Design a binder for this molecule. Structure first.
Ligand SMILES: C=CC1=C(C)/C(=C/c2[nH]c(Cc3[nH]c(/C=C4\NC(=O)C(C)=C4C=C)c(C)c3CCC(=O)O)c(CCC(=O)O)c2C)NC1=O
Length: 139
């Protein structure tokens, strides 16, 4: 369920992420900056259907943020890429956590799964796909 996602995560690898950020409309400074980040996540949950994610994106953007949501309930988001009017919703599909953002008539999706102990996110904006993986801290 949601329990398996809980706790701290640190980035392990990233592919095509700047290109994804450009595709969702981020300015070049932020897409190139975002591509270089090494984020840390702190995930917490309540009741198996509420989550809070605190993110330290890290250098070179140095943006910290958080999202808080209930599964199935749309919420407003103000992401680092500066898109306006973003409406987000998160739901489970099997063992995967699927996060959809809608803004300006467009949609983008993040699919999150645990694979051999790593948190793997696949990001899709139209034909542009990216992937990032996170690991647990050893201490
Ligand atoms: C299991 C549930 C789960 C959730 C809900 C989750 C959410 C999540 N993951 C990230 C990293 C993070 N950061 C960014 C984007 C940026 N980073 C930068 O420093 C800049 C400038 C940009 C934009 C230009 C994205 C698109 C993501 C989502 C992909 C990821 O999780 O790595 C953020 C920060 C997004 C932002 O800064 O706007 C959020 C809310 N991660 C999880 O593992």
């Amino acid at each position: 369920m949601v329990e398996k996602f809980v706790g701290t995560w640190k980035i392990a690898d990233s592919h095509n992420f700047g290109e994804y950020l450009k595709a969702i409309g981020a300015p070049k400074e932020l897409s190139d900056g975002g591509d270089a980040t090494t984020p840390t996540l702190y995930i917490s949950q309540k009741d198996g259907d509420k989550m809070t994610v605190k993110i330290e994106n890290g250098p070179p953007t140095f943006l910290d943020t958080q999202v808080k949501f209930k599964l199935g309930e749309e919420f407003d988001e103000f992401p680092s890429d500066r898109r306006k009017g973003v409406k987000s919703v998160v739901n489970l599909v099997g063992e995967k956590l699927v996060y959809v953002q809608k803004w300006d008539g467009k949609e983008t999706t993040y699919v999150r799964e645990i694979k051999d102990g790593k948190l793997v996110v696949t990001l899709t904006m139209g034909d542009v796909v990216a992937v990032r993986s996170y690991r647990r801290a050893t201490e």
